[model samples]
Target chain A: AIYADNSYSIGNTPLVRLKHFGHNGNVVVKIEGRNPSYSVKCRIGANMVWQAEKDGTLTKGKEIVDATSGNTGIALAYVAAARGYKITLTMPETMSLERKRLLCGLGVNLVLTEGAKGMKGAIAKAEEIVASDPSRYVMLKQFENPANPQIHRETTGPEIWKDTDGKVDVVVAGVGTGGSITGISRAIKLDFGKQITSVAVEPVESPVISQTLAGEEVKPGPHKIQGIGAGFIPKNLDLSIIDRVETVDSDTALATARRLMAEEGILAGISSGAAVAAADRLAKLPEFADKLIVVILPSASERYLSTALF
Target chain B: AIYADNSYSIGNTPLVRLKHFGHNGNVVVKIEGRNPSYSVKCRIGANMVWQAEKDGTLTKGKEIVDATSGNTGIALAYVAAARGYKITLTMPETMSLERKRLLCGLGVNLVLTEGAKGMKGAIAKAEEIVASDPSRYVMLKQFENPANPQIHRETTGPEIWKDTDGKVDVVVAGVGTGGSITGISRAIKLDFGKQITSVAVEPVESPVISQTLAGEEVKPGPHKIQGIGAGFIPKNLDLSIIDRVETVDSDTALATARRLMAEEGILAGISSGAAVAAADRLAKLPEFADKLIVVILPSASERYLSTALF
Candidate 1:
């Protein structure tokens, strides 16, 4: 009965071509724009909410709090709100006006900090609120929360492997909360071994954990690309699992975001754009030639329209 | 296999509750943010592309042209680009920069026109270029295209009917090209009987079929809500099927869009906000109390960041 009318669970997406660029390989993207909510955040939201509910952490009418800049906030807001939760969210004031408006419509209370404070400020603010309201509120802190990584591991990670049918050689993902890359990487690597390259993408300056432990640090800075770019390392990021890290500049990521909209018609979040960009960049490496690569799209179209355009 | 890696298709979205100050009915939105490309356009794109291939209209490597300013253009661009097509897209120069960049990254060619002309001007410009190279180009004209409507008739309509278990008393949808509402109405009416009231949503100033047919058209003017308002009547709009029409103002639409995001966590397009606003307005009528109502959500989260937020 659940499956019969759950068209929202799946979309009529396409394996779109990124460009006519020659790289001795097939450059394609499975556009996830067709999802009912218009972003890839749906998968994580469903998995997280359902898992939490099943585990008894989420009661029918409890209050939840979290910190997010874009799609994830909206996703959590939507799924949690739908399930009847009193949601209080924290974000940086610099976040897009559209994001604020969208969240407003959903009836979630929003708490915003100064713009320059970025996500860290928001996270800190959220943590303070959660700590102060211990008995009344539950925090779905995406970063440093096992549920964030676990959901992607169980849902998105395994799903990609099954959909691509073990043909994927490189698993490319963006580092937002580091939930997506860490979780998906663990699952893919366990199955494919070292043959599968786990390429992690981050904003040039503010990457959550954009480095190999004894190796060079990916220069950290700020970028307009929302969701990703942790100025300090996030606990959700397990650097040991990452085979390589690539940093993309803000301008490049911005350009790539738009290009994705035009060429792939994806209308994805900036983090996903960064992932696709890095994926394409790595696909050009002679090392990965002839290898099947899969890029994980994490957010939906309208989510980006809220942040990317404004 | 298809079920294994569903994230590659679309995000697991949430159907969350919506509450407003004046609205007496409970509203819910299915956030489509998790779609591959982050837009409901992915559904239309996939269905259209597949249908075209099934009908032999699209071969492996045909050149394609589309004119769009919203997520539709982005979806077409993504799929067409991913499939190795020589894509020529035309849009108003005033279109969001994020979109323009997203398309460029996909390696699709772009043609821009004056912002004053809007989508019509973009379409006209695209046609002019394609006409000279007639043998090499094909356009996915969404507004008047039968495929646009047909996709809804077959997929979205059936899904809604089944999802709500044929208990739907009213179906509310905003008219973009009228393709979605028209096609969905036809399917619902045929499957669920005429008793299922079909309500069409429109922007207050855009006096196209929706407003005129609803007997609410005061004047034909432009509104800030993108992708829905029509200055002129479109060819595909079928007014006979619409049981009632509600017009939403731009501020209300924007407010609703924000509220939907805030309360329900469903970040939708401006038009979707308008639809929900209209639906909420209509649901306030005593006749709709306790009746099941459904609304069609089109577009995704990525396209809304600009207008809906800062």
Candidate 2:
């Protein structure tokens, strides 16, 4: 009942079997929407902040600065408030009001970047803040932070493997910072590498990962989906670990998410819909028809109510 | 790996040690905000629906209807959608937009009652609907349903006892339908009734429970606090089980909730702060100076962001 704190309930999220995904009842979704902060980002938020504390990087009276679309910032804000650290989160104006309000309510200093510039502008603003005051601001750069993927490997990946009883054949996840896909794929490959399929979901509007994988000139653009398609190949994304990149359109992702909610009663975020759509596509293929596919639902639908996905 | 469904993750919520309640560190909060549906109402929602299923009142085609400010309706909506039942929730228009959007997102038929009439009007409307079409609508009346308190007696009470290791000297909870306080108090007193104190929190603006406890004329009125002060005593509220009632003002409740978010990193709803404020008062009293007080945080702050409490 009583743990170290509420943050102790950050991980070990429930893995649920989708009832009406229409895929032979073989598709299971790991619901991180059940996490304390209501998102998968809580896992990394705890790990990164905890790691910095252990490494003597995060001390008292210092501010935690990070750039995020919304989810990661909210999660980090939860950790920062719980651990007695001041925090500042930078996000684009395009992010939903729910996230902004939640972050502000949690007592975090929030900076809104230009909507057209999207997450990139948010990241640049965060970096600029950190550069101006190196001693006062400690930015846990999620895009390049090894702790981001390492935490997924330690907790998220292990939870998936254990929850599925290692019987899973394919793992599908939306690529945000690429930490989720990279760490989860690495963890699965460590045990069942040879035949396991690890798929990354990106926006069709911003097919940077797909184009990069095709050995073509990388061209990234704005996408309606909030979490995925960061518009650049991140340092945490390991190209060798991903078997394939599934590009999903905004309409298909939103529609699939709507279908999921209507059918299975799972109210997950839009990026989660992107992953599920990718998994749905994989399930249609002859080779994966009988395989046990697991999809990661990144967060809850509460935050996305203001967004058009709802 | 899987559950009966997501509703299976309803009970056994974590009891959090308040990091900064500031009373000798003896104050602990049971966070229902961590529940799958982000509220303690999920327990009653599952149990009421489940009991109806067992008793054959809830058949395959029956539609579930209930009146709530937000949390209970949302929880019922979650259960209904997961179990493939159509649900129609009647709530006052005064409830937050987040709840409305979430209920709509979950595919529930939402009927908004007049705001000034508050929850009383909503309940009357739900009853009217059920009376008109009893064959199609199954109203799981939370205010009168035994399962409402029964679930708390079964799960919420057991979790509190175990989490506190039977050392809890006091139990404080906000009385909405009085289900939470009545059930939890009964359960705890069964084991340690000789000395344990049970405190119920009500709005000073609408002190029906307080006035009733005093054997005075019950004159409940309009209150700014959302959850408590239903304007009338509910049948589910066991007066015999409650030892004392503490009336809290709207400003103190809201300010305390903000303090909790700022200090403890727990973003709980308005009534949750009412309970905490009561706990703080008890802590200051000479008789309870050394007692271990446990407060029930009924729901998450995400739903209350639109409210003035934030």
Candidate 3:
């Protein structure tokens, strides 16, 4: 009630223990769905909008525009609406109908692309929208935006440190724009040095990082797990900070997500499931025994009910 | 991370100010949808299940059976699934498909009643299931359970008191099972007595409480608002503690809910709109100027997207 705006209530998500997973409850998940907009990106969305507004880039009559088929779009819609800014969002036709309906209800100007085109297609459409009349639209450009990582570095990273009492042994996160892992890892590494492991999770079907490491051309395939497969590495991804990369198949990701809901009562999205799977793998190692591990769950399963996230 | 179970994450929801509504920021809302299960009933559902388990009424091999078409069913399904208990839930056929899919995803054994049968019909079917196999089924019986109200009295009430720093001038809530209003009112009244007024809200179409106060027959009618308007006064409804009753029309409730989403970025359910409307009405009164008014938003608007809540 003391807050000035809805955006002020973005971060400080709870870190809950996964009683059914890990060794002796060492695996914990940060419930980011607890944000005001019901997604972890709420932090970045708010920060981006606020930073732009402060810099006068997001002036009056400028529409907040972006390309997103998942939580980022929803977060931007809510934040834009609350801040009295008109928003225009683009998503692939393959995006879930539930997400489209929810975004439309929020009064977003939606542009759907070819289903076969996927996120890249949506991104191209968004870029075209901005290119036509650059002055009329201010794109948040989440994939390359510094604000995305900065918000996490300032809030998300510090919260993890304080919440875990600076005793974290490993950090597992799925890479979409790579802002979360990049910023969080930077913060943790600066505090804990090389002692804390930073594990980046990617879909096995579209293991771009793994493919790149193996000297193979990066080719991302369609995966049921949303929000973590971008086909290409994001500009903000700090690869130097990442200590390891783990790939989880779509089946394993979804199964782990269902287990989270049914066995731990944590209704998390598929991307979070991938993070959990990676964390579980690390926790099982004899070296990670009794070490504190934290995984960032980007959103809740409620958003993916219409999809095959189950 | 220190939590041993999900139920430990039930209460302590944020009390946020309605920045765009009320008199000079005097009106605030308890965002109960922020619960782990995304509903205020998560507290009651967790409490009911835990109490049943502790009392040995919900023993091994017994499935948790209940009749609920709303948040209670969803909350119960999550809790039951997490606690290693099978659950059977019955609902009207007309219930939203989104809710049905969500509960099914949680692995609930669902029983659908005739669309025209409504909640009472679902209840009848559940009773029949329990009667046929009393030893194998344990019904939560939320409407009549003391745990429902007791949880609110102990947690919800105390949280509001502590959150507001004991300066609350008015409390507003929509009554379904009446547990929230009854329990919260008792807690606030005991602390601030005659000074803190408790207001109960109901749909204008189904004004059972208003009709009862007018010495007339309580003929409850159909209303679009869910989670409230139980057609009859619940056993746990402590009417004596309520200082006033307010009724909001279905159209106004839905419109207000939409406005809350678009204008305030607060996506709340229809019942929450009724409570907000009531709080706004009280806030506008000349006598209630500059007083702290807390309204309880039972659930999030995400659950009602398929309905006319938008």
Candidate 4:
């Protein structure tokens, strides 16, 4: 008798152990791709709309607007379509053709920016659109939105806590909007104090996290790992709580992802591969022996099939 | 502490009711695309492998061979890769680029046959491969495999029954190898007797099911509805329990699937549209005004992005 509205089917993804890859520790992976839109972004996509509804910024007849790399756009498109709201998304034209087709299929309006300009260019275009007619469109700036982290703190953090029974020692996650790592780390720090080590992964080619953690100016370079390496430190990232940063090159990330499928049966995306690579590196350390290491697999590999991730 | 092999994540798909499309009946949909491989065929792929393992036909060092349209090939590729078994798949050259890329990524050996020959061509190639050296290779001929339907009888049927609280008055499904409809029909009929009406759907361009139901000879022609319309009546299709057959054209199926995304926010594949179109037709009937109808959504639209489904 319980009929589900698609927007409500966002979280509670499965947590499974990696048997073949990680070392002396208990390496567990949270398969976030299990979300309805096939990515962890679904959590924030629904949450942002819910928060907007509660605060009255997203009124009826106002279109939803956002700047995204791929997953977030697809997630937003799903929520917007289900709720009968028109949504327009701006993204680099270089975004996966799969994501573009999916968003277009959902009837989302698209604004394609130059691929060379990257995500920031898309962000600027979205801001410009919203600025032209503030009442007609509302931009949910995910890079700085408190709702993005808040939903993770509320849902993702507790799920991991319950699943791991509070014995989690290390958490490895790739930093995109930095919302996932920030919110999860904050929740875990509150629950377990400083006992849990939260490590953030980024493309070695674009070591923004390393630059930020080292107190150096953040400068992100181009990286093939889509959905991450935003070329700028997102406002949502809380550096104080992050224990460390791990950098992975595109080749290693893609190779590890392929290995994950061949060996572990987990068809994870490149970001997931980077996180897994980082977790594997952490697990090999003697200090982390027998400790529980949880890695966040942000999305599935199918989204990047057209790319070299295969 | 639990490790999940992808094969175990096959069934228990979510059943969400159709709110705007179907008539007064509580028309629910079983999202079989929720499977890890993004298709219901994952159930049969793993099931056939398990059965072969038990029956001693699939021993260590023996490569797995199969002929498929798309979903089944992808599913088999995943299981074979995870289990460290080399797999060879024969598919029509017209198979979706998405499917081909996915299978190739998983390291499945490909044997592309003429698109005009269709599924039959692929089957012939697989048969020849297994016939060349039965000791070195094994084919889980899905069109004739009992395990294909048996898995549905055990998992899909029970899940629908439990989810619907056993009040299912009608079941609608598209015919491919006929495993899904056949197995599901058998299970539902066993539980509900003559009370539950089981309807089969097939491409109107190749009205195999309609021809079968009409007591006329079935001569299936080419159709764009992939994964169905096997040029011949599959041995697995049990016509005894089928109450009716509904024929849907390619355009309606694609349009309904597109509407499913834009209106219902369900990004279902073309075959899913065909099934829904049939279910909507059934729901319009006076007898089904208050009945409980269940439609099976076989897969996602991600695979059909390059095709005209968009």
3 or 4, greater by DockQ: 3
What lDDT tens digits, residue by residue, belong to model 4 across residues B84-175? 78999998998767677777778889899999998689999998999999899999988899999999898888788887888888899998
> What is the clash count for each candidate, in the order shown?
110, 0, 0, 0
Ranking by DockQ: 2, 3, 4, 1
Chain B TM-scores across candidates: 0.87, 0.93, 0.96, 0.94
* Native contacts recovered by model 3: 0.40
- Give me the displacement of residue A86 in model 3, in angstroms: 2.0
In the range A194-269, model 1's lDDT, one tens digit per residue, is 4577787877766546454446565567577666776666788888888888878777777776666554444555
Docking class of 1: acceptable
Each model's chain A TM-score: 0.83, 0.93, 0.95, 0.94
- Which tens-of-lDDT digit does each residue in B1-310 have in candidate 1? 3322221343333343454522444344444444545555665665666577688777766777778777676666656654556778898898767777667655668899998998789889989977977767777677676777787787667766776667666778877777767777888898656567878777777756555665765467879777777766666667778788787899888777666555544556677777788877777777777766666566544455545432
Between candidates 1 and 4, the DockQ winner = 4
Error of 3 at A84 (Å): 2.0
Best by DockQ: 2
Looking only at chain B, model 1 earns a TM-score of 0.87
What TM-scores do the predictions have?
Answer: 0.73, 0.93, 0.94, 0.93
Candidate 3 stretches greater than 4 Å from native: A92-97, A112-121, A128-136, A192-194, B59-61, B94-97, B114-116, B133-135, B192-194
Tell me the TM-score that candidate 1 gets on chain A alone: 0.83
